[PDB]
Amino acid sequence: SIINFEKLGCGASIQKTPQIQVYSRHPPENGKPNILNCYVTQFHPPHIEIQMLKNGKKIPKVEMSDMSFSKDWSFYILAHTEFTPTETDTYACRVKHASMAEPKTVYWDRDMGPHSLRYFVTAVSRPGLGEPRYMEVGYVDDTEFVRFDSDAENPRYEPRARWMEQEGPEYWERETQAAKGNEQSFRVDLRTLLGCYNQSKGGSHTIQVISGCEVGSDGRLLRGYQQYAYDGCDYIALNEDLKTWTAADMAALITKHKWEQAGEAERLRAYLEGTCVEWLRRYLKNGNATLLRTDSPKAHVTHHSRPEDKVTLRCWALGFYPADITLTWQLNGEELIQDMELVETRPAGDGTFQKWASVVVPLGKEQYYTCHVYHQGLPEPLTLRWEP
């Protein structure tokens, strides 16, 4: 259950470039249907335009995931489309974002315990295009389980996991009206923050919030979160003492003083230690079947030619959950962290994740190198080599 937010009350009346990965969900074999992913991360503002292309031509039926954002406030989204790869068909993803003067085209390179209840909130103004888009997304241990999206004719809180359907109508009614009340507070905050930052009246701006609690196995609050951002930058955040605020700039110093006078830190501490903890216990009970599940990675090495007497060994880790994982290459028992190439961990699109790490080695010396896969789902780290 999300908290009822208090207005920032700042006063009376920088963009990040996207990172792109294009990859198939499964190993691409010609003639076999597959899924082509376009993973776009680390961008701000949230507005973005993603097209997937086949031999230069736009692919019509491209499905897009809901947009989320990370702890560093940057947004990410997954686009994907059905495709049957052939030997000569070229695929690419093209991204248009305000941080770039031209659209970026990336071509598909077919190269062979404690718990937490957190709410991620986004409010994005759209001057001349309608009302601000407001979103509340709840997570139990990185697993999205509820969502409120204002972009509907009758917006309501919706279960995003099957185990949330047990909650009765009184729950969804109360959460829905709480979200609509929260939406109004952020609409007002978007209005006043314009003047507090001396900004024009016709541009799109964003407020982001991360609110919730991390609770240990003993039921005690490990960490409480109440962190705000405006236009992707730190605005104000509750400190770990749950008593004082860290205001990131001058405009937030007005909010800090007002919240001190109103005793907002005490209201948040009561929610975090009480309501948040009690609801997390309820959500953990109802989702006990699938929330604790982990899928260990399946791993293998691929072999790629290089100019002259070098080859590339690429160590794959596939189908694992959660996303936290470590891949290392070793020569003679020492880790070659200094000369590996990695890709950021990426979703397969079916709930599991992918990652690979590569190293350039001399031709004929492939059997001298070992890849190591560390994941919490493994009873022991994986160790493997290139098998011809």
Author numbering: 1 to 13, 24 to 122, 143 to 418
Which sentences did the original study use to describe this structure?
Based on an examination of the native structure of the SIINFEKL (SL8)/Kb pMHC I complex, and the structure of the single-chain SL8-β2m-Kb HC trimer, we introduced alanine substitutions at residues 63, 66, and 167 in the MHC I HC which interact with the bound peptide in the A-pocket. Positions Glu63 and Lys66 interact directly with S(P1) and I(P2) of SL8, whereas Trp167 caps off the N terminus amino group of the peptide. Similarly, the hydrogen bond between the backbone carbonyl group of I(P2) and the side chain amine of Lys66, present in WT-, E63A-, and Trp167-SCT, is not present in K66A-SCT. The space created by the shorter Ala66 side chain is occupied by two water molecules, one of which is stabilized by a hydrogen bond with the carbonyl group of I(P2). Interestingly, the side chain of N(P4) adopted similar orientation in K66A-SCT, whereas two alternative rotamer states of the N(P4) side chain were resolved in W167A-SCT. Expression of WT (*002) ERAP1 (25) in SCT transfected HeLa E1KO resulted in a significant decrease in the levels of all A-pocket variants detected by 25-D1.16 (∼35–40%). By contrast, the SCT variants exhibited higher RMSD values of 1.7–1.8 ± 0.2–0.3 Å, a first indication of the effect of the mutated residues on the conformational dynamics of the antigen-binding groove. The peptide in both E63A- and K66A-SCT displayed low RMSDCα values (<1.0 Å), whereas SL8 in W167A-SCT deviated more from the initial position, with RMSDCα of ∼2.0 Å. All three SCT variants displayed lower free energy barriers of dissociation with respect to the WT-SCT and in the order of 3–8 kcal/mol.
MHC Is are heterotrimers consisting of a transmembrane heavy chain (HC), β2-microglobulin (β2m), and a peptide antigen, typically of 8–11 amino acids in length. Major histocompatibility complex class I (MHC I)3 molecules present a diverse array of antigenic peptides, the so-called immunopeptidome, to circulating cytotoxic T lymphocytes. Here, endoplasmic reticulum aminopeptidase 1 (ERAP1) and ERAP2 trim peptides to the optimal length for stable MHC I binding in the final editing step of the antigen processing pathway. The construct consists of SL8 peptide linked with β2m and Kb HC in which the C terminus of SL8 is tethered to the Kb-binding groove through a disulfide bond between Y84C of Kb and a second cysteine within the peptide-β2m linker.
